[PDB]
Structure 1
Amino acid sequence: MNIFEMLRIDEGLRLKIYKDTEGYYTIGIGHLLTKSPSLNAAKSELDKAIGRNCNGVITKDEAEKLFNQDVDAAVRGILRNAKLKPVYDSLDAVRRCALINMVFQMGETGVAGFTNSLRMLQQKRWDEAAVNGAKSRWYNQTPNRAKRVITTFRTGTWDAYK
């Protein structure tokens, strides 16, 4: 299993503009287009991201391109983030993936807010981190996804995904 396969399970793949769980316009494999209520704004954003007149629809190929860019962006974001980098550097391969997943989902800022959890991760206090990270809006809004990422952090294995 790898990051792409992981994220592909958690986000799905939709070729037509759709509303994510918070009601935001998205497309592909979890690619947020805009936080604005307007489908037009969404459609504009899409054309601009794709480089053509998509008319709210993209191809698999296009979805995968956006996905490749977003995953790269998440990794580079972590590596540039003063708060995130050390955590990332301290983790084993599987757990790194879990951190990449969260960042992809909620952005650097959002993840950087799990101060106490990050600290525990850094101290290799797996069980405590899992319990603390569960006390969050994130967990309460998308419990199933959250549980899968949390188990990955807790155990360092891909069990939650197999």
Structure 2
Amino acid sequence: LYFQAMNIFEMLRIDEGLRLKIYKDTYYTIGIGHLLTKSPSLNAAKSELDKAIGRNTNGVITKDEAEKLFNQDVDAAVRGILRNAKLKPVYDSLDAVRRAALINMVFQMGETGVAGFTNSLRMLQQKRWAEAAVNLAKSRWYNQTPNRTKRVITTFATGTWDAYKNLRKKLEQLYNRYKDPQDENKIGIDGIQQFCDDLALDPASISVLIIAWKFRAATQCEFSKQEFMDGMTELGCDSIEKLKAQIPKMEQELKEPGRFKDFYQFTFNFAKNPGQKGLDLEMAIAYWNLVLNGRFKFLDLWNKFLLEHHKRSIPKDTWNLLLDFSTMIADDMSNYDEEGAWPVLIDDFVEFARPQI
């Protein structure tokens, strides 16, 4: 296998993204789109992953492990392309860099999807790079993934890694403005403040929390280099101005209850201290005031109730269920099911609140 792929791993890590934990596909997946099983059983998915890696991974792997899986998929993709009468001649005719761009297309839309680009593939085989680049930009492929597609088209247009090299340069330069002087691998207190200042936003604002959700950031007041790099690339941003222009789209998403529920539950995980399973009361109240503002009629009475009668940590299930409570609760609380499976804390709140109407 060693006689037969160095830049291809980084090309698809940028275009498709690298996931280190087993995730749900629109199917059990890990790494750069590696399929584990067609089964709906996670036990089966973990078994396949454990067999493929050679250890009890419990659904979590390293980047080197993700690379080993990726190299297997590249090889399988190459075998498939060569068995395809519509793709083999174009693949054979192409140089190493342009083959990597064709494998990228196969990874995205499969062989049948790629074979559909008959006019474009002909131009590539004919080495009419300018004509092929213009033609590929006309497709729906270009609108569905404009950032990824432009990068792949550039690879076919130039036969170089310039689209990937230049994105990484732009992000690396931008990163240097925010990196911690005491730790190059992260953005510190100062850096996060600067990032927020550059976006003309307060670091405790709802907009910054929406950005944190979109970046899948782990913890408040922390921001790793990997979080910044992956977040900026997944969002198709290479500057603060581009990220700033993405905020209204992120805001519109939250008007749909499914997205709002995902963001609301993410807030708990983001707000909590690493090493703690619960969220401290003062912190829970501060984030509730931000995310439940204009969504929960009883928010202030809830805060007063907790500060005087609970005075303890908030578990994840209670945090999650509070959104369901806020949605269903009547203004007079007359519809509250005192025997309807709510946490005891919410039964206690309704008992405390009801005399005050």
Compared with structure 1, are the counterparts of its residues 40 and 87 closer, same or farther at alpha carbon in structure 2 (3 Å cutoff)?
Answer: same
In structure 2, do the counterparts of structure 1 residues 55 and 71 end up closer, same or farther at CA, with 3 Å as the change threshold?
A: same
Tell me, which stretches of 5 or more residues in structure 1 are unaligned? none
Matched, 1:153 2:156: yes
Question: Are the equivalent residues in 1 in contact too, given 2:31–2:66 (CA < 8 A)?
Answer: yes
Report the Cα distance in structure 1 between the residues aligned to 2:24 and 2:147, rounded to whole angstroms.
Answer: 18
Alignment deviations for residues 105-156 of structure 1 (CA, whole Å, 9 cap, x no partner):
2221111111111011112221221222123332211111111000010111
User: In 2, Cα distance between the equivalents of 1:111 and 1:11?
Assistant: 17
Aligned residues: 158
Identical-pair percentage: 96
Asked if 1:79 is matched to 2:75, the reply is no
C-alpha displacement at 1:93, in angstroms? 2.3
Shift of 1:19: 5.1
Equivalent-residue separation in structure 2 for 1:129 and 1:81 (angstroms): 20
User: What is the CA distance between 1:89 and its match in structure 2?
Assistant: 1.4
**1:28: Cα distance to partner?**
0.7
Q: Residue deviations 1:47-90, cap 9 Å, x none?
A: 67667775543343432221111011111111221111110111
SS of residue matched to 2:60: coil
Distance in 1 separating the partners of 2:130 and 2:38: 34
SS class of match (2:132): helix
Higher mean C-alpha deviation, range 83-92 or range 40-49: 40-49
Provide the TM-score with structure 2 as the length reference: 0.38
Residues 17 and 150 of structure 1, relative CA distance in 2, 3 Å threshold: same
CA contact under 8 A between 2:16 and 2:33: conserved in structure 1? yes
> Structure 1 residues 82, 32: closer, same or farther in 2, change over 3 A?
same
Q: Structure 1 residues 18 and 143, CA, compared in 2 at 3 Å: closer, same or farther?
A: farther
SS at match of 1:53: coil
SS of equivalent residue, structure 1 residue 99:
helix
Question: Counterpart of 2:23 in 1: which secondary structure?
Answer: strand
Displacement of 1:34 after TM fit?
Answer: 7.0
Is the Cα–Cα contact under 8 Å of residues 129 and 157 in structure 2 kept in the other structure?
Answer: yes
Provide the C-alpha distance between the structure 2 equivalents of 1:40 and 1:136, rounded to a whole number of angstroms. 40
With 102-111 and 42-51 compared, the bigger mean Cα shift is at: 42-51
C-alpha deviation, 1:40, in angstroms: 8.0
**Structure 1 residues 40 and 92: alpha-carbon distance in aligned structure 2, compared to 1, 3 A threshold:** same
Tell me how far 1:35 sits from its aligned partner: 8.3
Unmatched tracts of structure 2, length 5 or more: 1-5, 164-357
TM-score under structure 1 length normalisation: 0.77
Cα distance change on mapping 1:13 and 1:88 into 2, 3 Å: same
